[PDB]
Design a protein around this ligand. Structure first.
Ligand SMILES: N[C@H](Cc1c[nH]c2ccccc12)C(=O)O
Ligand SMILES: [Ca+2]
Ligand SMILES: [Zn+2]
Ligand SMILES: [Zn+2]
Length: 273
């Protein structure tokens, strides 16, 4: 797998920040900042060679969208998916929640094209709408994916809040192979990890698709032992700006975003062979 350039991930975050500022301060479902976010990500993927689909749904009286991007080729009976919700709450720009995961998944998708990678498994990336309404976009996707296509899914990897400013390094404790792949990446860095309905992997998990993911913490407070292993500040939230107007470009830990973006790519490469 390639090393995902941190600067490229941060440049996507800058673009999402600007989109929020241009659209009433947020990127929330039903509001123009969300669809502008979708248009940004879709344009980068289309230029890289992806087959993109805008999947529309209605929730709360407003049109929502999922962005699905298929990398042409690979075994159609073995699909590896990775995704991230692209909506924010309406109080702010949602840069850590969940620009961070959205930008890491986008840069990994772009890295696939730059590397000329041809995975054995077919690769599909997704950016979910309306996660903050209750996983509505990922539920819509799973609910509308026929059972023959669900059975072709080898895994779903989720990335939701991966740049928290006072981070932990949490790995989902779900499918054992996906979990081992992430934990092995961090082991090679000599960075400890801890085991993690809270995000878009839940609709996949609930229908028996193997899932896993990365998380750097939200509203809970970092313990003394966690500050010993990862630095930062004991007694403060992992993300002091969770769901807040201050979930801005200032609300990112660059080391965590870099490591988790690199880990995302490592897992996507490893699990697609
Ligand atoms: N509620 C999620 C953030 C979140 C909190 N705990 C977890 C565990 C696993 C994934 C995500 C989360 C959100 O608003 O994005
Ligand atoms: Ca990197
Ligand atoms: Zn989130
Ligand atoms: Zn959230």
């Amino acid at each position: 797998a390639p090393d995902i350039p941190l600067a490229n991930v941060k440049a996507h975050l800058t673009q999402l920040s600007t989109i929020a500022a241009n659209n009433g301060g947020n990127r929330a479902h039903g509001r123009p900042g969300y669809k502008a976010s979708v248009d940004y990500v879709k344009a980068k993927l289309d230029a890289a060679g992806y087959t993109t689909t805008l999947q529309q749904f209605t929730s709360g009286g407003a049109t929502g969208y999922n962005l699905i991007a298929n990398w042409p080729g690979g075994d159609p009976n073995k699909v590896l998916m990775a995704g991230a919700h692209l909506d924010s709450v309406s109080s702010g720009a949602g840069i850590n929640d969940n620009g961070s995961g959205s930008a890491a998944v986008l840069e990994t998708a772009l890295a696939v094209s730059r590397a000329g990678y041809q995975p054995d498994k077919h690769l599909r990336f997704a950016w979910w709408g309306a996660e903050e309404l209750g996983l509505i976009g990922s539920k819509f996707y799973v609910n509308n994916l026929p059972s023959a296509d669900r059975s072709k899914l080898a895994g779903y990897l989720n990335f939701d809040m991966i740049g928290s400013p006072n981070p932990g390094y949490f790995v989902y404790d779900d499918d054992p192979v996906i979990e081992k792949t992430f934990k092995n990446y961090f082991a090679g860095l000599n960075v400890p990890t801890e085991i993690e309905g809270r995000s878009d992997h839940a609709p996949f998990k609930n229908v028996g698709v193997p899932v896993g993911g990365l998380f750097t913490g939200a509203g809970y407070t970092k313990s003394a032992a966690q500050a010993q292993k990862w630095g930062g500040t004991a007694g403060q939230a992992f993300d002091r700006c969770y769901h807040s107007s201050c979930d801005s470009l200032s609300n990112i830990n660059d080391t965590a975003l870099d490591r988790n973006s690199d880990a995302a790519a490592h897992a996507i490469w490893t699990l697609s062979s």
